[PDB]
Scaffold this active site. Structure first.
Site, mmCIF file in Angstrom:
data_model
loop_
_atom_site.group_PDB
_atom_site.id
_atom_site.type_symbol
_atom_site.label_atom_id
_atom_site.label_comp_id
_atom_site.label_asym_id
_atom_site.label_seq_id
_atom_site.Cartn_x
_atom_site.Cartn_y
_atom_site.Cartn_z
ATOM 1 N N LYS A 1 6.218 9.179 8.161
ATOM 2 C CA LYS A 1 6.117 8.679 9.533
ATOM 3 C C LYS A 1 7.222 9.212 10.445
ATOM 4 O O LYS A 1 7.119 10.339 10.941
ATOM 5 C CB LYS A 1 5.958 7.145 9.555
ATOM 6 C CG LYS A 1 4.692 6.744 8.797
ATOM 7 C CD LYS A 1 4.451 5.268 8.634
ATOM 8 C CE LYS A 1 2.956 5.016 8.333
ATOM 9 N NZ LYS A 1 2.291 6.188 7.736
ATOM 10 N N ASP B 1 9.407 2.221 -1.345
ATOM 11 C CA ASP B 1 8.509 2.949 -0.450
ATOM 12 C C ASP B 1 8.942 2.607 0.965
ATOM 13 O O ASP B 1 8.619 1.525 1.483
ATOM 14 C CB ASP B 1 7.051 2.578 -0.690
ATOM 15 C CG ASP B 1 6.117 3.381 0.171
ATOM 16 O OD1 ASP B 1 6.610 4.108 1.063
ATOM 17 O OD2 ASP B 1 4.896 3.285 -0.020
ATOM 18 N N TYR C 1 0.850 -1.178 0.000
ATOM 19 C CA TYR C 1 0.000 0.000 0.000
ATOM 20 C C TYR C 1 0.891 1.234 0.000
ATOM 21 O O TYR C 1 1.822 1.334 0.809
ATOM 22 C CB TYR C 1 -0.922 0.003 1.218
ATOM 23 C CG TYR C 1 -1.794 1.241 1.257
ATOM 24 C CD1 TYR C 1 -2.881 1.380 0.388
ATOM 25 C CD2 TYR C 1 -1.522 2.290 2.135
ATOM 26 C CE1 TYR C 1 -3.683 2.514 0.410
ATOM 27 C CE2 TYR C 1 -2.317 3.428 2.165
ATOM 28 C CZ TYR C 1 -3.392 3.531 1.296
ATOM 29 O OH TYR C 1 -4.181 4.653 1.305
HETATM 30 C C1 LIG Z 1 4.462 2.034 3.132
HETATM 31 C C2 LIG Z 1 3.399 3.092 3.109
HETATM 32 N N1 LIG Z 1 3.426 3.994 2.120
HETATM 33 C C3 LIG Z 1 2.459 4.917 2.074
HETATM 34 C C4 LIG Z 1 1.411 5.004 2.959
HETATM 35 C C5 LIG Z 1 0.398 6.102 2.786
HETATM 36 O O1 LIG Z 1 0.773 7.220 3.653
HETATM 37 P P1 LIG Z 1 -0.274 8.368 4.135
HETATM 38 O O2 LIG Z 1 -1.438 7.671 4.850
HETATM 39 O O3 LIG Z 1 0.578 9.270 5.024
HETATM 40 O O4 LIG Z 1 -0.788 9.108 2.915
HETATM 41 C C6 LIG Z 1 1.338 4.053 4.006
HETATM 42 C C7 LIG Z 1 0.216 3.929 4.954
HETATM 43 O O5 LIG Z 1 -0.760 4.602 4.998
HETATM 44 C C8 LIG Z 1 2.384 3.117 4.075
HETATM 45 O O6 LIG Z 1 2.444 2.222 5.085
#
Ligand SMILES: Cc1ncc(COP(=O)(O)O)c(C=O)c1O
Ligand SMILES: Cc1ncc(COP(=O)(O)O)c(C=O)c1O
Lengths: 430, 430
Positions: A269, A241, A149
């Site tokens: 994060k 990612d 995700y």
């Molecule tokens: C690996 C990863 N990338 C991207 C996202 C999306 O980030 P955001 O909710 O800050 O838009 C998440 C979780 O939501 C994630 O765990």
């Protein structure tokens, strides 16, 4: 708690009002507890290893606000840095020194990044990274992996002769969805076959180097190296990612831990210390395609804001202390071993995974290497365990498909209390 | 300032380092000053009506961090609310009461919204709103207006038999771009013709109800009503992007000021009190298409975070005080009149526009109603005026294509000092 006779009266009142005012009563779907059943609790405050709900109940927290709180909640050094920044005003609309220090810190700690660009979320980081990959390569197709995700950019809201993608949500155009190709995580042969068929047309391949959004699934030995080789052979950009793994699997991220150099990395994060903050970065020549240096447009009015930079920098300082990740990796190992033992004592089949300070608990006897194994787990048994753990004062991620998180506030007594809770909760859930 | 002999030594050192580490040395393109020439200054702090740069120079600020600071920078009530929230932890990953209070406040003040969903930026709000419009209507085409800016979602990075859109940035797929149609702002006949040709296929029409991203361009009388009528006649959703106008043109936004009920509204800026915060909202039945209530996916890990909710709620309380917007609208009128008089005295042709607490200054003799008139202005003369105003200690938006902003910290002496500055700066720029 307010009642002496796990009362949730105050959470229930708030949730009932919220359902009339927010879709599903929440601002992010997982918070609604639909996977586990029941109603969520509302949080009053967070401190150290603990969440405190509006009914006065305290939980040992393995969600950690979904990753940012690697030093625990409300760490005094992070709080001090934030309070100092607040006195200077919350946002400027113009550059501040904290943005330079943040870029210096990320690029020093994650040297595949010569240049970075801050954004406001993981969603913004990954939608920018794939636009950069498309614009730099002149190609249209993006590869992602089932179970990963990346946020809700429309190109990611897609599922599997040419395996053209189809949308997973209404409102996502079909034509755009065809440009996203989906592979199984950890499948060497499927990746090779896809690049043999259409590698010339792949702009970028994006992956959680350790999966966290299908529970915690580490890569098989050589798998990330295999993907790096395919991307380089075919001219596609490898995008890691690291929104969840960055600064958590290791100081240098999963790319340091496994020895991979991606072309682009996305961050989030931990880099915001609890505040909304994302980033993307890579080699200078590639990043200089981004406006205003180059023609690929991306902007953000509140990006690089000074309070978020101060919070993230304070956390990044703490995670650079000697032995930080080795300590958390041992604590994570200790927790996982104790969960396995508690489950075995109760006659419940579980296995675990872990990389650094993230882990996965699985209701299965298999060692989980694939999305198919993660989904073959006993999901109703997990749901019973989740609620039994809540009753014992432990908050695990409310999903069989989310990795858990250790923090430096999870001291020996916190870990032991978690194991005492699990000894009862596994029996409740059997 | 640090030097007694507008020294920018400290900003120059920071900017030189930043250029190696961030694309163009900035985290958002406008900050690089490329439109006006020269190098940006780095901000140390902000307070009341003022920015203070890292060289010790103080500027009266008409950017206001691009809109959030309608009560001025570093307002003590907002700061107090934020400090109180910080003590509870910066982020929870689970619901908090502030999210309910925020939804109650937005829906009460902007009653076209029965339900809202918080996000982390204007970009996230508008990309969500158009996905909602596509998913709810089952149609693919989105209409936007030349000169409006909604963020960097790929469907917005598009320019004009069927007038199929083409991308404005590399990395934006061509197929997706064809689904975005572009009209001229304030053109009644062009809007009618487009709906006559393809209204059945338009999911949504998104507009800044008062343009701010081509400088400040107010709608012609009946124009927004005309767009509302076309959308209703043809089954398209009217989307007001009130990221900039919300809580600024009027307490109830441009939709209250002009008497329009949109189907969706996007919000940002003021609703975060200076912190990263967006939102979208509309009628309950429509918003219940959004996950987890319905099938249209949108999520955000840090959305609704408690510090941002506290900052925005503190600002929303201040803007509800009796007479708030009437006061700022008068201050804005006073500033615009003084700018016209200062320019006339210098023999420089200007005109102004204003709605509530936003305004536009134009280097032209025409009353600006169209994008073509905004772009026909004397851009080099604006650039000279911008730098001359900086030298007089006033920071205007560094672009001939950005609206300016009044705040409640711009007291009578601040406004008069701005006019004294303009009297010299117009002569410098002549
Ligand atoms: C690996 C990863 N990338 C991207 C996202 C999306 O980030 P955001 O909710 O800050 O838009 C998440 C979780 O939501 C994630 O765990
Ligand atoms: C009206 C409007 N909508 C949306 C945006 C994009 O918001 P953000 O930069 O927070 O993503 C802006 C300016 O950037 C704006 O003025």
């Amino acid at each position: 708690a307010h009642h002496h006779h796990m009362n949730h009266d105050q959470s229930h009142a708030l949730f009932s009002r919220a359902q009339q005012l927010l879709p599903g009563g929440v601002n992010s779907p997982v918070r609604a507890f639909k996977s586990v059943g029941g109603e969520p609790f509302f949080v009053e405050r967070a401190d150290g290893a603990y969440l405190y709900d509006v009914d006065g109940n305290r939980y040992i927290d393995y969600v950690g606000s979904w990753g940012p709180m690697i030093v625990g909640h409300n760490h005094p050094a992070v709080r001090q840095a934030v309070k100092k920044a607040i006195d200077n005003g919350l946002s400027f609309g113009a550059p501040c020194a904290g943005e330079v220090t943040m870029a210096e810190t990320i690029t020093r700690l994650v040297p595949s990044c010569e240049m970075v660009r801050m954004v406001n979320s993981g969603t913004e980081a990954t939608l920018s990274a794939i636009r950069l990959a498309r614009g730099a390569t002149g190609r249209n197709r993006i590869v992602k992996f089932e179970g990963c995700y990346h946020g809700h950019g429309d190109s990611f809201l897609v599922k599997a002769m040419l395996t053209l993608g189809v949308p997973t949500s209404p409102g996502v155009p079909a034509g755009l969805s065809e440009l996203t190709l989906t592979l199984p995580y950890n499948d060497f042969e499927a990746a090779t076959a896809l690049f043999e068929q259409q590698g010339d047309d792949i702009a970028g391949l994006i992956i959680e180097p350790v999966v966290g959004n299908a529970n915690c699934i580490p890569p098989r030995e050589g798998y990330l190296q295999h993907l790096r080789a395919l991307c380089t052979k075919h001219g596609a950009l490898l995008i890691f990612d690291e929104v969840m793994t960055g600064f958590r699997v290791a100081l240098g991220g999963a790319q340091a831990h496994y020895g991979i150099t991606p072309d682009l990395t996305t961050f989030g994060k931990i880099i915001g210390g609890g505040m909304p903050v994302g980033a993307y970065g890579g080699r200078r020549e590639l990043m200089q395609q981004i406006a205003p240096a180059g023609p690929i447009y991306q902007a953000g009015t509140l990006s690089g804001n000074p309070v978020a930079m101060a919070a993230g920098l304070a956390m990044l300082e703490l995670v650079q202390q000697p032995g930080f990740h080795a300590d958390l990796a041992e604590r994570t190992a200790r927790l996982c071993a104790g969960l396995e033992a508690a489950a075995a004592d109760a006659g419940v089949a579980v296995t675990t995974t872990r990389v650094g300070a993230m882990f996965g608990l699985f209701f299965t006897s298999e060692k989980v290497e694939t999305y198919a194994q993660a989904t073959a787990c006993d999901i109703p048994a997990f749901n019973r365990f989740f609620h039994a753990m809540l009753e014992q004062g432990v908050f695990l991620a409310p999903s069989a498909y989310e990795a858990g998180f250790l923090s430096s506030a999870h001291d020996d007594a916190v870990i032991e209390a978690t194991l005492a809770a699990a000894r009862v909760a596994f029996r409740a859930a059997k």
